[PDB]
Ligand binder design. Structure first.
Ligand code: HEM
Ligand code: HEM
Lengths: 667, 657
């Protein structure tokens, strides 16, 4: 195998950012004139360019497709992908054969971006242009929210004929369903996306393939980043090759109407081969034959439908809904508006992160909405009383720290989804997770925490009240203060109140299941279904929390000694006196009086026999990789020194503070 | 991965601030200068003698192991680009741990932790291992030259990086470390008067190879151990030979033995005396082997190679010369990659500057203030020198910096001196001999009639004229800006300049000046990436420097390759806003060359280009930065970004600041 890659933790560093450090995305994209931007984009779509002549004299459909391909790489498994930082500029995404001829679109949008510059990120534009194109044709969309930041280096990572080159509609139905289920799109949403997105535009296959050149990443230097140069005929325009199929779906390819489902359910479809050798479907009995317009103004075309678009006619659970839409268009417009809004905004986070004047004024359950604050927040003079009340409630530091971490470690920095906001660790999909230990001391902790707000709120000075979501994090901070005060350090953990409490109706139990950690390395948990070893999954978890190598190291080192790991297992607790935040985990695995040997009862744990032969410690794979990996052993030796205890405690407090406030986008 | 030989921009942010646990307000220079060094030597000495069970010491002394570890840490220096050596952050990280001849050094860095844990953040790992070697050397009868702390350690591996048949091999190996014949002879002889190799077992296969490589696949539980099936106590690492009869003391015994008896027999790997053995040497635990079954791998070339044997046979009866020469050679070896003498800290550093450090005279006059700088700036702007001449001269003097080993830079004033004034890239047939002449006249006229004891040095004038140029160009573009200038450089002389040691600093290909010499391994773009990595420039600083130097007239030989502007010698972002111009169609020039030409303004040619200054519009990750600086509102930000990058690269070698 290959050694673990610590460069994944410090991805997208500051030195690669041309905008500097004093740059605020929201503070500027909240100031543009969206009407002016709409005018600029609308005059970019309708003016043809000789480098890529526009079909029908409208670049709209190209921009809709670019917006779909930008946001169509989201994965609910891991969260990475989607619009996000707009990675279809750098990554393999710009060189995939699936993304053919989308470099041209991003090139055509340069005149818009040139005018605005730093106050309009690429990620917005390639997702806004499409959303404007979809509205330029007469489909009143649902709303748009700017605010997805631009990034400066790539990351780590369905056939038009259906299966692997086999034209079959019923067989492509399951492929479409499975590839759209990874985006978390039910049958209605995926049918609406396929029907709506194909009422516009055409397919580009006018010439035989094998004449196009290489992708942008392996293209000649003089093409300026535009791969897939075609040598067929003129090369571009009427002779453009992008996927090798020549399908034009509707007779109105630059206007929204119910002309897709009427063609699909109107003719009988028979199989035929594209001019470039691809499989497609054409109307049987020569029906049509000169009804669909030609982009450059030549002779008309017989009706033609792709191999996967016919699925919506043979799959019963697609056929039912699409036939209903054929009898009811306004439902199709509604479903497509909502599905498109979900598609381009799925990996963007809480509602408090959308910007601009187009953002809708309603809560959609797929956003995991949390209520707005209905009272003045708890003041600093009053979090002291509440902190003391928590510290004198009989709850051990282990229980409080474990509960606070369990609440606030379900965050996905890739998806901005999860976190401690909303107070969902009390709710059904999350109180029952195995790592959280629904048994034991989570119901007890939650009860003794919500019997504290029940007393504080009733006997409160004015309108000031505290929410449960704040109470779990405040208990974590109180426990850390109590622990550090036992190691001799008098510190205060920073705490910014404001979290609210989400009821059960606003929590989608089905949605909050991919958030479940199959392996949380900080709590020393390793469930089944893990693809990689333990240390790699800890590294992945740390990357998701947007943690760096020093923060991850100090966090695990302090979190073992604080006693917040799975089932209170004594794995990696390298301290004699627990319930105290000290330096002991680092200074005890650098000890060379201890010889680490795998446990004879093979279960993936190691036991470090002392000098005299007695077993002193008992680590695990996650714990011992810090003493083994050279570039993590380098970091352990920083906190394992003799003078670096106060530095360690302040670094742990900083990392804990960073983790608790990951989800706080409202402040 | 899927795109091998793609432009790897990840090299420009090596060792970021994210991965540094010490923070940003941590300066190692002010930390290590406060440690007690006598306490450090006492701690190291108590570590060396006190053997530990997991790696027992030969003769009860870890000295020779620490000497060997310090040699191997500092023995990877490459004169080609300076990378390697004991610069901190190499020997303890992924490539150099698992490494066939770094055998026992994995359990020789963890042997010093009882000291690093005592001192912690105020003593780096590189400083610790090299100083451990030096103190081990000094605790076994030898008196070294000196020592200087300051090797700040990095937190990330660098993505970059029998009879006489052995004489030429070791000669080449030590020649590509910048070591001449006397220094390499002294280094080998001195280093092999200390210790043995180790014991031996059946073979390297059945022994130190249970997936034995510390980081690749050693396995957890054995965090660093070339484990052996033999015992690893007294016999280890699978090669047995001891050179001198006193392996823990400096005296003339290596080459008294070597010149004592013949070695025609090779046992199993050089025997002794052709069956004249005995008990001259001493073993580690007890017993005693033959009379020096020594001279490993037939590296007695010091007695066979005709030019080694001369100096070596001289050292047979003149041990003082060997002592002194080994002192100087060792001091050079462990301090080669550390830079100017202003960078050495601590109380051990000797007050004697050698010619290999590129010495620069210390300041004797008073530095120019904020009024004399303005007066000189005006005097040098109104002096008949164009912006292109001033900018290309200032960039020529300060782009000769090798950030890997901090050698070169604008300080020293050596562009007026022979090794640099005659380089092809510093086009001497052009204006260099004229620009330096008029700047010399300026300084003579200035400090001849100076106010008080304030004087200006030539090394200051080249840089100041560089700043007085881009100020004029920016003012001729609507943006009046002030370029920071820190006086303090002093100018060297040809006596302190090593002509044959600066040949390695010659730019084989400079991308910012659009130079490309014959004999380039990689294309013109990867050479630019290497150049900017050597200058310690991020990616945006690369981009802004290239786009400024193009339009600002700094091209090699004033070639109009990449001047995508019509306003001559003015600081604008016309390079970016015209490189992204999609109205022109690039194509290789009909001359079978590496130059392009973007025609189709209408149907005519304009804006000749090249691979260096056209990959910016091609590479997506660089296309992003160009689109940042080529926007409509980016005109005033590009000016200040260029000024910041220019200031960074001019003050790049300023360690005396
Ligand atoms: C199973 C699902 C889908 C398949 C197999 C599919 C496949 C394709 C293919 C092969 C093309 C031709 C590309 C070209 O010729 O340049 C195309 C074009 C297009 N697709 Fe899709 N697509 C799917 C879903 C979607 C979705 C969800 C949307 C929008 C939300 C969409 C919008 C478009 C548009 C507007 C075009 C026209 C592009 C142009 O005119 O250049 N498609 N699709
Ligand atoms: C062509 C030049 C050299 C060659 C081929 C060479 C080779 C070797 C080899 C094979 C070993 C055995 C290591 C072991 O058994 O663990 C060794 C050890 C050693 N080397 Fe060198 N070496 C060279 C130059 C030097 C230099 C320049 C120094 C400078 C200090 C040095 C210092 C040492 C010392 C002190 C040891 C003893 C290691 C111990 O006691 O564990 N050698 N060398």
């Amino acid at each position: 195998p290959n050694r673990l890659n610590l460069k994944v933790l410090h991805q997208n560093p500051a030195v690669a950012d041309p905008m500097g450090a004093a740059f605020d995305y929201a503070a500027e994209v909240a100031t543009i004139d969206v009407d002016a931007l709409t005018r600029d984009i609308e005059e970019v779509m309708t003016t043809s360019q000789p480098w890529w002549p526009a079909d029908y004299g409208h670049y709209g459909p190209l921009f809709i497709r670019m917006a779909r391909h930008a946001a169509g790489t989201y994965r609910i498994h891991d969260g990475r992908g989607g619009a996000g930082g707009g990675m279809q500029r750098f990554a393999p995404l710009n060189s995939w054969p699936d993304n053919a001829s989308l470099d041209k679109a991003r090139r055509l949008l340069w005149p818009v971006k040139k005018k605005y510059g730093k106050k309009l990120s690429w990620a917005d534009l390639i997702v806004f242009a499409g959303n404007c194109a979809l509205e330029s044709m007469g489909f009143k969309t649902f709303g748009f929210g700017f605010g997805r930041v631009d990034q400066w280096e790539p990351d780590e990572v369905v056939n038009p004929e259906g299966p692997n080159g086999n034209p079959d509609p019923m067989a492509a139905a399951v492929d479409i369903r499975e590839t759209f289920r990874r985006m978390a799109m039910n049958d209605v949403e995926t049918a609406a996306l396929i029907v709506g997105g194909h009422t516009f535009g055409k397919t580009h296959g006018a010439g035989p393939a094998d004449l196009v050149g290489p992708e942008p990443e392996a293209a000649p230097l003089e093409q300026m980043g535009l791969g897939w140069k075609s040598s067929y005929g003129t090369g571009t325009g009427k002779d453009a090759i992008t996927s090798g199929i020549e399908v034009v779906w509707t007779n109105t390819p630059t206007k929204w109407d119910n002309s897709f489902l009427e063609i699909l359910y109107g003719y009988e479809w028979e199989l035929t081969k594209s001019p470039a050798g691809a499989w497609q479907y054409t109307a049987k009995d020569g029906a049509g034959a000169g009804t669909i317009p030609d982009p450059f103004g030549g002779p008309g075309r017989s009706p033609t439908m792709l191999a996967t678009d016919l699925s919506l006619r043979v799959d019963p659970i697609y056929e039912r809904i699409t036939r209903r839409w054929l009898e009811h268009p306004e439902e199709l417009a509604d479903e497509f508006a909502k599905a498109w809004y979900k598609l381009i905004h799925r990996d963007m986070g809480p509602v408090a992160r959308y910007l601009g004047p187009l953002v809708p004024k309603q809560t959609l359950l797929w956003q995991d909405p949390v209520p707005a604050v209905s009272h003045d927040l708890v003041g600093e003079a009053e979090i002291a009383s509440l902190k003391s009340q928590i510290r004198a409630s009989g709850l051990t530091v282990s229980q409080l720290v474990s509960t606070a971490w369990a609440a606030a470690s379900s965050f996905r920095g890739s998806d901005k989804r999860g976190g401690a906001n909303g107070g969902r660790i009390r709710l059904q999909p999350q109180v029952g997770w195995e790592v959280n230990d629904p048994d034991g001391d989570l119901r007890k902790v939650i009860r003794t925490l919500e019997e504290i707000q029940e007393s504080f709120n009733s006997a409160a000075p004015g309108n000031i009240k505290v929410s449960f979501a704040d109470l779990v994090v405040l208990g974590g901070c109180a426990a850390i203060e109590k622990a550090a005060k036992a190691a001799g350090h008098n510190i205060t953990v920073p705490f910014t109140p404001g979290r609210t409490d989400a009821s059960q109706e606003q929590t989608d139990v089905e949605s909050f299941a991919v958030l479940e950690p199959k392996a949380d390395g900080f709590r020393n948990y390793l469930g089944k279904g893990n693809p990689l070893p333990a240390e790699y999954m800890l590294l992945d978890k740390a990357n998701l929390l947007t943690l760096s190598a020093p923060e991850m190291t100090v966090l695990v080192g302090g979190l073992r000694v604080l006693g917040a790991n799975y089932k209170r297992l004594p794995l990696g607790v390298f301290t004699e006196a627990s319930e105290s935040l000290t330096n002991d985990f680092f200074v005890n695995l650098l000890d060379m009086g201890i010889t680490w040997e795998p446990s004879p009862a093979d279960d993936g744990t190691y036991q470090g026999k002392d000098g005299s032969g007695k077993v002193k410690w008992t680590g695990s794979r996650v714990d011992l990789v810090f003493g083994s990996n050279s570039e993590l052993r380098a970091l352990v030796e920083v906190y394992g020194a003799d003078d670096a205890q106060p530095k360690f405690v302040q670094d742990f407090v900083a990392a804990w503070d960073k983790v608790m406030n990951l989800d706080r986008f409202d402040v």
